[PDB]
Chain length 432, copies 4
């Protein structure tokens, strides 16, 4: 029983697979620290003034070496933390073990069941003689749990920092029922650059290579949707020598596709000739059963947008069709006449299963979360209110500024005359 | 000084030019199918029937297509030039011949300018109820000289940054008692004006002024907003090596992520072949920078005014200026070192490149739709302030231009529309 | 022993790890067939006429599913084949078994010793009642083995087809020793496009992702050498937002790097600031111990050129440095003060250990090899004498032509007057070799 | 005029008073031709062309002036004529005349003037040439025909033109080439500029000049995917055009595919394209029938050869109406009102509507100077009586001398590396 474990200090206030993995886990955390200089720089700069002294943070995020560097940064700034996984598969057990040995109440392991998942959140949140005043959440599951099961604890929370798209939607559904301030770091300016364009551009190629070993040259590709995600996928494939067609419902984005040098088509016009279909819409039923029926043999289908509904994968579970798992995250769906399509990640986000977020990008996110937590926790009366807010612009600039040394970038400082000219402070914020 | 037909109610150099100008218009019609499509879609239903529009814009074949689009939709119009030199006489003639009270010619004098404006406005038994202006000078004239008529105006559409500024200064004072629609902040218009145009114009302006080859040039672009982004991308695509300066760390981080060294100007000033300012700021390139530049360095401005580069600092008496080609000065130091200054530090594209007709169509169409939007507005909707073009109108501008590219827009199903929380006919995004 | 196995027909004329893997192998081969339509079209078009009837082919290549499709094409055109692996680690055991079960004498398994290697080559080549006519070799080891050990068999070989840079160099010695015609398919025109530029362009990003999970944006990269390989690496990294510096010894290539938008530097000018170093020179000691000492902490170093000597990896085996293997093909080399460098694939070619050749590219090579074998074997006497020849241009065009349907590309035909105007046959060749 | 300052009249130019203005243009050209200036400085007062007596027949531009003065600085004695009756810059010719160069050239020579100028250049009392530099083969022809004894004592001929080189080969096969010639038309550096770098720029520049177009979203078909086609496609693609490619050679067709273009037959796209560009070296690629099928306002131009890639002659018919609307731009109008925009009458667009950068002219002039040095100073037996290619090492030196323009720094092989590669440290580094 994994529940019967103690760390070297005699505590058992945690639940991890194997506490003896701690030393291996601490080595992986040390590695992440060396790859995240900007988070280490924020830590060192900010720790002396202990701006999270009295912070009692409950977190639900991915339990990786990089998340540990964030957690221990929060600790260095004076916080007390409890933590659970936001996903049943993503936990690095050795990291969970290292955190438990160092004294973090963490309730997390790889391969949790649904019941384990909620059990861990409750153990994270409901503990004798300690109540949270801050939430850090990736998905809103932990937030909702406190909401439904501990309404009076929920009312006392000073701040919710939320990282996910769906988590942010749920906070917006809260109908006058949101009674504490929330900070939407999903739409922070520096984050968005990375999360949308830069990451998807790389991860479309990485995931396609991982799943198919394909060559990109001369592939006919259709990308549905031309927002930032679509733009990024289009640019990546075009740079690798693919021929890319674009679909859109918004004429303004459509015109941009045209100006960017792509043919703008209805899916039907190209469905029968394409080698690759990629959904980037945030919409449902973009690729229908009939589209799938019209696809040529060996056409590859994937989703880079949301959920698993952009492609109607459910429509492929009819008795007539045969599925074969040929590789991790890769199914051949086969028709009676032998025609085959290649479906990736069962139509879930390709990058989540088949690529890895660079540590640098995890640093951008972690840094943003840390500053949002500091901001909500230390905020004066009246500033924030029963509503969803954005990170102050100066803090967003600070995230960028902390990461600039990675590139040996040299920022120019405005002179006094230029600052007056533009109506700005020398220290920012530079844009409204 | 007299047309076909009955009318002397116009004024232009020479009305025998009607046939030459009319061919010109007919070509511009072919190069502006979005405006022609707007007539096809809208002229039956006559959305501008009862609009009496006075216009003050550049008198070109492209502008003619717009004016006759306003006609086709119902409007009655009179027009003057917004600039004393820019008129195409032949086009003026041809609009006259078909019966536009047009008051404009090339090489006007200052008084003739206001004379022409006054002839648009005043005017027998015809009181204007709409203004389309590029400059704000027709609007100002009407404001000051005909205050009671001004209060009667249903709508003002102004194209210039400066005209818009003046409209916001009226509103601020409480004196804008008619609605204005700002046509410059629309998503479509900004894209062309800020990125797409600049991408092309920096390259065209540099070729025109210098005959340069781009490959292997060392370039520094000051500022990485939309305009700098565009110039960096264009030059990089032509094989130039581009360095970037910024004061905003978020923009600086983008420049890095896009593949550029992010530097202070002093780090590269002595080695670059080309310096381009895209900042909106003053004294970005100082006298000291100019002194430190190597022989034959090219300096130009893609930002604002003529002050990003401190050109005034180069007018000291020991420096020698030689005009070597239109818009190109060599500024020579006592020791014989030369820099090459383009367009006297003014916007290079304004004097060394040409706006494509397609982009003139985006502008013209936005202006037509704005006029239609104000004129047919319910009494509630617009009153005594500056409004932005509604998003649906910007979507239509874009939609009207898609046939240039053979682009095929997809339509949402009812299920998808409901899923996204949107109307099938848009608007598809906020703002 | 491994050596004590029979196929379902009682033959033990092969040596394979495990014959019961045959059925799984056969399914891998069938997958490869579907992904190599151009080789299957060549097969189907050329089969009936049996252009390789009487051909007795000894091959030494990578034993993958794709190679199987080539081998069975050769069989389908009438050849008799025996096969061995050209590398001790690359054999896919299940494919070797599928082959052995279909009746190919194949001598190959993953993880052979050096003695095993030469033993397999000997078994492939030296067998009572069957002399080879033709050699297909990737590296020259099989060719060398026959030359040295069976010099009378060698004199009787109708044709050598060689695939590899080092194999071709070896053939060129010749020296007066090459008494049979060889065809160099390493330098075929269609092949080269894919082997040099198109492969490296993809490989570099894939291999770096595989080994480091890096992002490319804002990485300062120095690429040594600006031939096709370096060119391909530069374009790929540039397109992903890296800042790329190039080194060259050839001023004509240097000038092209400049025109392509890259700063051209000496390595020491950027060695202290770069995040990634890539060697693409075909030269040795391009990155020396002293360069590695100068590198900043966490700099990534890899080779996309030849062998393992472009970076002087041997210089890092000094007792004050420690190595930690941190992932497959990833070592951290750590200095007394704690500075580290990240070395990939021990300075061997990154793409070979950390990427995969797309099957389409394996198709181009296989089709090329097949046609070279056909040409040599059916050649009039004495079109080919005692030298190294290139694949006929028309065959090279045919390789390209067979693969165009993958892209739905529609080739234009010269009219009769255009053919006359240009001085070209309607069916080519369109350009000289 | 008639005499220079020193009272010589051994020249023939329009007006000797133009010297000062010409000198100024030469000075500007010097600043844009550092490679030639560096050859001058490297001499260190030695005279590597001391005994050379060079007759030259080239375009009389400011760039040519710098070459001629470089040959003089190296110790050559030079006489010169124009290779073309229209191209002479009179001010430059005057400046050369003032400096003591016997130049016989002016703008608007008649055909009789042209040959007289050549005769004045090569036939002078008490001075025979021993070297020829020629762009066209006409000076060479004159000497061969009129002064056959002088011809036989020529030490070397350097020839710049395709046609001049063709003529030298005719003489050679006839057994009549009794002196060494060097073909500097074909060097690897020159090839790359003429075929790829210059065309990449000139197509875009030529299209802007003629039509004021925007490139974004244009549908373009490029016929031919050799070096010129490759360059045109990459330039238009980089500006956001959608580009289709035609080819007869499957190897080139496959490259187009792999580079991210659709590979089509012209007929598949002739009705939809906005721009047609011919880059084939072939005849009747764009036929009368293609022209009839083009959509209204389609722009048509040639980047290949001659004026026959497009069948322009088929449009010179009473049925069709031609209208010159701008320099090098015709609207060709059909009875039904459909219009085509023909550029440069289907001649080479770049030659009428663009400028060769001075850098490219420097590559050419530097090549010529080095070929002259090499031929003049070669030891007995190196160059027999035949056509030779520019040696590789000298092509490398040309390139190398131009690298400082880019602040580019060349690496040098160690002894151990040179040995490993089987190369001399100083080159040549590649075969040919
Ligand atoms: N894979 C990832 O890691 C990742 C990262 C960030 C965002 N996303 C998701 O990707 C989706 C798109 O993100 P974005 O930032 O590009 O959003 P966005 O709204 O800017 O763009 C989506 C585009 O799709 C278009 N669209 C909607 N329905 C369509 C249809 N049926 N056919 C064609 N086009 C249609 C819209 O007009 C819009 O332009 C969102 O759901 C977002 O959450 C994924
Ligand atoms: N040439 C044209 O036709 C054209 C077209 C549109 C806009 N503009 C003008 O171009 C300028 C830039 O426009 P934009 O849309 O890119 O604006 P914006 O988003 O860029 O603001 C300009 C950028 O320059 C940066 N900057 C300010 N001062 C700087 C300094 N001293 N050094 C380095 N960077 C500095 C700012 O941080 C900002 O990122 C504005 O003046 C705008 O009106 C010109
Ligand atoms: N990674 C792969 O799968 C792969 C594929 C094909 C070829 N290759 C190999 O890559 C190497 C390069 O191939 P290529 O086709 O580009 O060859 P190439 O000979 O055309 O290019 C190599 C370049 O390196 C330059 N060079 C030599 N020494 C140098 C040095 N010390 N510093 C800087 N530059 C130097 C040369 O001038 C040359 O231009 C060869 O060994 C080739 O066999 C590798
Ligand atoms: N505009 C210029 O300044 C300039 C510069 C250099 C060369 N050129 C000329 O451009 C032409 C092409 O030069 P290159 O260097 O690209 O030569 P190239 O031989 O490499 O390429 C021409 C290509 O056209 C293809 N082709 C031939 N006929 C065709 C047809 N009917 N349809 C489609 N494709 C066809 C050939 O397969 C070949 O690949 C030549 O005439 C050359 O002399 C012009």
């Amino acid at each position: 029983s994994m529940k019967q474990q103690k760390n070297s200090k005699g505590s058992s206030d945690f639940c991890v697979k194997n506490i003896k993995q701690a030393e291996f886990g601490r080595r992986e955390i040390e590695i992440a620290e060396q790859e995240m200089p900007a988070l280490m720089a924020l830590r060192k700069r900010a720790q002396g003034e202990k701006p999270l002294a009295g912070a009692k943070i409950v977190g639900c995020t991915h339990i990786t070496a990089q998340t540990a560097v964030l957690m221990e940064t929060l600790g260095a700034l004076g916080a007390q933390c409890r933590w659970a996984a936001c996903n049943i598969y993503s936990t690095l057990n050795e990291v969970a073990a290292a955190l438990a040995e160092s004294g973090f109440p963490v309730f997390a392991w790889k391969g949790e069941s649904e019941d384990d998942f909620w059990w861990c959140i409750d153990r994270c949140v409901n503990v004798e003689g300690w109540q949270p005043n801050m939430i850090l959440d990736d998905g809103g599951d932990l937030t909702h749990w406190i909401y439904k099961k501990y309404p009076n604890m929920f009312k006392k929370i000073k701040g919710i920092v939320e990282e996910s798209v769906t988590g942010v939607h749920r906070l917006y559904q809260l109908a006058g029922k949101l009674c504490v301030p929330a900070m939407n770091v999903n739409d922070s300016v520096t984050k968005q650059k990375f999360d949308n364009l830069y990451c998807c551009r790389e991860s479309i190629l990485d995931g396609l290579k991982r799943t198919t070993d394909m060559m990109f040259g001369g592939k006919q590709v259709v990308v549905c949707g031309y927002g930032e995600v679509g733009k990024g996928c289009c640019a990546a494939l075009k740079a690798m020598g693919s021929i890319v067609y674009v679909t859109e419902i918004d004429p303004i984005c459509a015109l941009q596709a045209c100006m960017d040098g792509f043919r703008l088509v209805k899916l039907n016009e190209v469905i029968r000739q394409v080698d690759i279909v990629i959904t980037c819409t945030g919409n449902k039923n973009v690729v229908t059963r009939e589209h799938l029926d019209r696809m040529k043999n060996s056409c590859i289908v994937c989703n880079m947008g949301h959920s698993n509904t952009e492609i109607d994968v459910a429509s492929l579970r009819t008795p007539e069709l045969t599925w074969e798992r040929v590789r991790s995250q890769v199914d051949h769906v086969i028709w009676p006449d032998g025609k085959r399509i290649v479906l990736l990640a069962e139509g879930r986000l390709l990058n989540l299963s088949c690529s890895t977020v660079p540590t640098f990008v995890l640093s951008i996110t972690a840094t943003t979360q840390a500053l949002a937590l500091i901001e909500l926790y230390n905020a004066p009366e009246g500033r924030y209110k029963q509503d969803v807010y954005l990170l102050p612009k100066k803090m967003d600039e600070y995230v960028a500024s902390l990461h600039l040394p990675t590139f040996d970038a040299h920022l120019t400082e405005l002179t006094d005359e230029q600052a007056k000219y533009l109506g700005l402070n020398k220290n920012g914020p530079f844009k409204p």
